[PDB]
Amino acid sequence: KMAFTLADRVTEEMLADKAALVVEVVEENYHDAPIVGIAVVNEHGRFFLRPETALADPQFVAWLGDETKKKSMFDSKRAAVALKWKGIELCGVSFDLLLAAYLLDPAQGVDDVAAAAKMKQYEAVRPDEAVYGKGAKRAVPDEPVLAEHLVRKAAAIWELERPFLDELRRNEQDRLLVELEQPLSSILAEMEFAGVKVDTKRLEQMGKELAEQLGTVEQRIYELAGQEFNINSPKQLGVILFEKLQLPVLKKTKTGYSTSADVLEKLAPYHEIVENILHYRQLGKLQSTYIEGLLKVVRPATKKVHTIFNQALTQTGRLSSTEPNLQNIPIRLEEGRKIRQAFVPSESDWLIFAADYSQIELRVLAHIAEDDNLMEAFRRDLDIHTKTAMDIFQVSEDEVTPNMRRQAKAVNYGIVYGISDYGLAQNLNISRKEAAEFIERYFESFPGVKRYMENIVQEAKQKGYVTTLLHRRRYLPDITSRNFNVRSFAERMAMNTPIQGSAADIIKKAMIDLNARLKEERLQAHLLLQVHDELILEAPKEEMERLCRLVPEVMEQAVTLRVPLKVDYHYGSTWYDAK
DNA sequence: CCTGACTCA
DNA sequence: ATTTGAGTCAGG
Ligand SMILES: Nc1ncnc2c1ncn2[C@H]1CC[C@@H](COP(=O)(O)OP(=O)(O)OP(=O)(O)O)O1
Ligand SMILES: [Mg+2]
Numbered sequence: 001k002m003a004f005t006l007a008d009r010v011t012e013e014m015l016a017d018k019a020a021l022v023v024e025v026v027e028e029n030y031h032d033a034p035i036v037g038i039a040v041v042n043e044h045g046r047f048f049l050r051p052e053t054a055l056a057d058p059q060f061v062a063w064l065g066d067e068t069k070k071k072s073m074f075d076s077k078r079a080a081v082a083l084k085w086k087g088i089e090l091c092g093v094s095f096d097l098l099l100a101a102y103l104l105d106p107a108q109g110v111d112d113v114a115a116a117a118k119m120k121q122y123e124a125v126r127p128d129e130a131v132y133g134k135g136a137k138r139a140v141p142d143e144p145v146l147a148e149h150l151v152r153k154a155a156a157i158w159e160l161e162r163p164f165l166d167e168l169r170r171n172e173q174d175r176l177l178v179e180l181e182q183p184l185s186s187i188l189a190e191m192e193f194a195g196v197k198v199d200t201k202r203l204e205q206m207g208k209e210l211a212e213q214l215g216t217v218e219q220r221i222y223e224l225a226g227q228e229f230n231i232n233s234p235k236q237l238g239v240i241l242f243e244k245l246q247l248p249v250l251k252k253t254k255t256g257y258s259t260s261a262d263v264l265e266k267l268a269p270y271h272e273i274v275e276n277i278l279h280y281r282q283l284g285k286l287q288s289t290y291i292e293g294l295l296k297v298v299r300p301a302t303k304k305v306h307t308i309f310n311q312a313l314t315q316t317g318r319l320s321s322t323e324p325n326l327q328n329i330p331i332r333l334e335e336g337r338k339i340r341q342a343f344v345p346s347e348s349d350w351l352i353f354a355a356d357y358s359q360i361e362l363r364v365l366a367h368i369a370e371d372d373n374l375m376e377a378f379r380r381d382l383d384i385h386t387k388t389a390m391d392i393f394q395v396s397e398d399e400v401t402p403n404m405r406r407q408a409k410a411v412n413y414g415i416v417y418g419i420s421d422y423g424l425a426q427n428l429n430i431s432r433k434e435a436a437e438f439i440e441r442y443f444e445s446f447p448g449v450k451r452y453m454e455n456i457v458q459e460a461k462q463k464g465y466v467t468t469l470l471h472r473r474r475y476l477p478d479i480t481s482r483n484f485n486v487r488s489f490a491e492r493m494a495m496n497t498p499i500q501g502s503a504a505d506i507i508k509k510a511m512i513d514l515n516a517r518l519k520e521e522r523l524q525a526h527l528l529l530q531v532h533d534e535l536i537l538e539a540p541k542e543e544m545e546r547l548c549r550l551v552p553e554v555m556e557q558a559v560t561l562r563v564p565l566k567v568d569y570h571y572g573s574t575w576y577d578a579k
Numbered sequence: 580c581c582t583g584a585c586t587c588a
Numbered sequence: 589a590t591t592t593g594a595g596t597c598a599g600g
Contacts, residue, residue, distance in 0.1 A: 232598055234583055255582065285585040288597055316593060318588080325595045328587035336586080360588095361592095410591085417591040424591085485589065496592040500588090504593095532588040532593085 002124070004039075004046035004151040006144070010054055013044035015063045020158035021071040022150045023051075023079040023090075026132055026140060029323050030078045031192070031306045032085045032299075036140050039150035041158045048147035061088055070094040072157050074113050076182075077311065080189040097157050099181045100164040102312035103173045107475055110312070113153040120163050125152040172471045180470060180505070181311065183512050188309045188319075191527050195304035196326065196343055199574075200295065203342040207291040210283060217280045224273040231280050234259045245271055266429060282336070290330060290339045297324050304346070309530070316497050317472045317504040318532060327531045329575075332406065340576035345538045351571050353525070353544065354578040355551050357507070357533040358566035359384060364503050365416060367561040368469070371448030378563040385409045392428065392438070415442050416449060416499075418492040453495050460494035468498055469559070470505040506565075507533055510558035517554055521546070536575070544571055 007014070022039040038049040054060045063069050064083065071090075073079060074097040080090045101110040101119060110116045114127040131149045132138050140146055168174045222228045225244070229236045238257035241247045247270050251258035261281075264274040297305055310320045321327040329343070330336025345351055357363075362384055366374040377384060389400045389408035400408075407428075414424060415438075425435035443450040457479075460466050465475045474497045479490035511530060518525055525539030525547055535555065539547060552567040559565075572578045 230599075232584080233600080235600075253583080258583090260584080281584065282586095285597075289586075289595095293596070310594095314593060318593060320594055321587095322595065325587080328585095328595065330586065332587080414591040420590040422590050427591090488589070492591065500593060534588080 002046070002148070002152060002155060004048060004147070006048050006147055008053070010049065010057045010060045014040050014042070014047050014049070015059065015069070016042040016044055017068065018042060018070045019072070020154040020161075021073050021079075022154045022157070023073075023082060024146075024150055025078055025082045026138070029308060030082045031308070033082055035082055035086065037146050037150050039147075039154040041151065041154040046151050046155060048151055055083075055086055055088060065089040065091050067091040072097070072161050074098050074116065074153065074157055075312075077185045077189045077192075080186065081193055084189070084193045093182070093186075095157075095161050095165070096177075096182055096185060097160060097164065098312050099185065100168060100177055103177055103181065103472065104164070104167060104171070105473075105475060106312075106315050106317075113156050116164075117156045117160060120160060122156060122160055125149075125156045171473065173473070176471050180508055180512070184508050185311060187511055187515055187527065188311060191529065192306055192308060194346070194526060194528065195299075195302070195306040196528050197346040198294070198298050198303050198305055199342045199344050200298060200303055203291060203295060203339075206338065206342070207287065207295075210287050210291060214280070214283050214287060217276060217283060221273060221276050221280055224271075224276060231277060232284060237277065241267070241271075241274070245273070247271060247274075262426065282333070286330070286336055286339065290336070294324055294342075307529070314504075315474055315493075316501040317468060317508075318500065319504075319530060321529075326529055332403075338576065341574045343575035344573070347538075347540075349541050350538050351541050351544060351573060352528075352575050352578045353537045353539060353547050353551065353569070353571040354575070355535050355555060355567050355569040357503075357555065358568055360506075360533045360565075361499050361503050362412065362416075363561065363563050363565060364469075364506070365449060365452075365499050366563045368498060368502065369449045369452030370562065371446045371452070374446045374449060375563050378566075381564075381566075384412055388412050411438070415439055416453070417496045418453075456498060457491050457494050460490070466494050466498050468501040468505050470502070470509070472501050472505060474501070503533060506559050507535070507555075510555045511535065513558060514551065514554045517550055521550070523547075523550075536578075547571070 019040050019042040023035055024037045025033045026036055027033040035051040038051055038054050040047045069092050071093050072095040073093055076093040076096045083090045097113065097116050098110065101108065101116040104119065112128040114125050117125050126149060131141060165174065168177055221231055225240050229240055231237060235256060237259045241259065242249050242257045247267050249257055250263045250266055261278060264278050267274045305324060307321045307326045308323055310322060313320050330339050363378055366378060385405050385408050386397060386400050388411055389404045390397055392408055392411060393404055414427065421432045421436040421439060424439060425432040456466060460476050460479050464477060465473050467473050476490045476493055478486050479494060481487040507530065511527065523539065523543050525537050525543050527535060527537050529536040548569065552569050555567045556565045570578045
């Protein structure tokens with residue numbers, strides 16, 4: 001039905017200056033993964049190429065790397081990174097169907113061509129899973145079966161480009177795709193392929209010392225409990241706490257007694273064992289995830305870890321980070337924070353540079369809600385987190401520890417994002433009456449915020465979606481539900497999504513501008529990680545003074561708001577020391 | 580395989 | 589009924 005040529009060799013007509021291109025990587029993690037087949041669809045026809053052939057052809061390599069030869073693809077970052085592991089540079093990607101689908105509706109969770117094709121009732125293509133199988137059954141099919149699939153995906157991208165571009169424009173999301181998400185994709189590809197170097201000697205030594213400590217904590221817990229049990233089993237732990245030790249049951253879930261951190265902290269006046277158990281579970285996560293888990297994914301020859309930043313997953317426009325996640329490395333307790341000493345520069349005499357947006361979503365909220373007191377508070381360069389802390393704990397602006405400031409931060413965001421008196425009371429372990437009062441005195445300080453939250457909920461109910469500064473959209477079909485719980489969740493997404501998502505837009509624009517600046521000044525410095533409202537770089541030590549100016553400036557100037565943007569920054573010999 | 584732990588923004 | 593957005597892990 002769909003004619004295509006199974007080429008034995010690359011020909012001139014395959015190298016047209018506009019094409020839909022498929023460079024197939026079947027493994028979920030595409031770092032150093034096999035390329036199993038290539039497809040090209042253009043004005044001249046439809047082609048399948050064997051990668052052994054095509055990727056060793058100097059004209060095909062040349063075409064891939066030619067910025068003036070425009071390619072339409074699906075998940076171009078996957079291809080770009082797979083090709084870098086093959087030592088080949090991919091340039092000129094002009095359209096990405098994955099990112100196009102993501103912006104049109106992130107709720108669809110589009111993650112193959114067939115799923116994007118369905119958005120426009122295009123059915124002449126199969127889902128990837130149906131072709132390759134799942135779990136232990138996964139496999140590349142016989143060549144003719146593989147070739148047809150790849151070509152059908154290329155044909156889909158080719159015929160779907162205009163319809164998707166048309167709808168993006170209708171939505172005012174065309175520049176968001178072309179000028180923000182697509183250029184970011186290339187930047188993320190660079191970051192992933194660069195990787196972050198790990199000090200495995202230090203990490204392994206930390207692991208040995210941690211094992212000993214876990215043993216000591218473990219034995220003490222058994223002593224306190226009067227028996228041995230699996231502390232890492234919430235079920236067994238529940239029996240010990242609420243049956244053997246007869247402690248009060250504060251919460252249940254569908255599976256049985258809750259042993260959450262929040263519940264165990266509240267049980268501290270009844271038995272010292274709950275504090276030990278909380279310590280044990282913290283240490284155990286360090287070991288399983290940040291020592292053992294991390295060392296499993298280090299590439300042994302280079303000692304580097306290579307994350308994958310998922311650009312088309314979160315419902316608000318944030319990135320996520322997987323295998324390993326490098327956006328949740330410990331920082332909040334000194335015990336876990338020391339993990340960051342194992343993340344080091346990739347060359348000697350280089351350093352790690354880290355920058356963080358100050359009170360980021362509160363600034364954005366001030367701008368969007370146009371609240372008087374809040375907009376003013378940032379012109380006066382106030383720290384609303386610390387002020388809130390002084391108030392909540394009844395202390396002076398010098399008795400506020402970092403932990404206290406962090407706890408205030410969750411209260412400040414909690415409130416603007418819809419926390420109830422019950423939630424706030426449980427969060428700070430205070431009376432609900434007292435909690436209700438903090439909330440009241442909060443919306444009195446910032447009345448425009450309150451209006452904005454009422455107003456954005458009403459709007460969402462009328463339009464059925466909310467939007468960000470750069471025209472990112474989230475649909476919220478549940479917001480007019482007759483069901484209280486379902487409706488309430490959707491209403492809180494309407495409160496949060498425009499703010500978190502606008503803040504995502506900003507740091508994304510900051511990454512693009514920053515790279516442009518790094519290139520024009522021909523610095524060796526380069527981005528390693530993004531952590532939502534943080535950018536981590538490494539660079540020669542001689543570039544630290546110039547970065548101290550360049551990085552914060554670019555980040556602060558990324559957009560222009562009604563309030564200042566403020567960036568904190570540091571550097572040092574390890575990620576830990578960049579504080 | 581899911582749930583409830585821990586980790587971050 | 590009860591802040592938002594994420595990922596990985598051991599246990600079961
Ligand atoms: N508990 C929470 N609830 C909702 N959103 C939160 C959150 N914690 C963080 N976020 C969201 C909202 C904030 C944003 C960034 O996290 P930062 O810790 O960096 O908060 P920032 O306000 O920038 O504080 P600063 O840098 O001055 O210490 O992510
Ligand atoms: Mg911040």
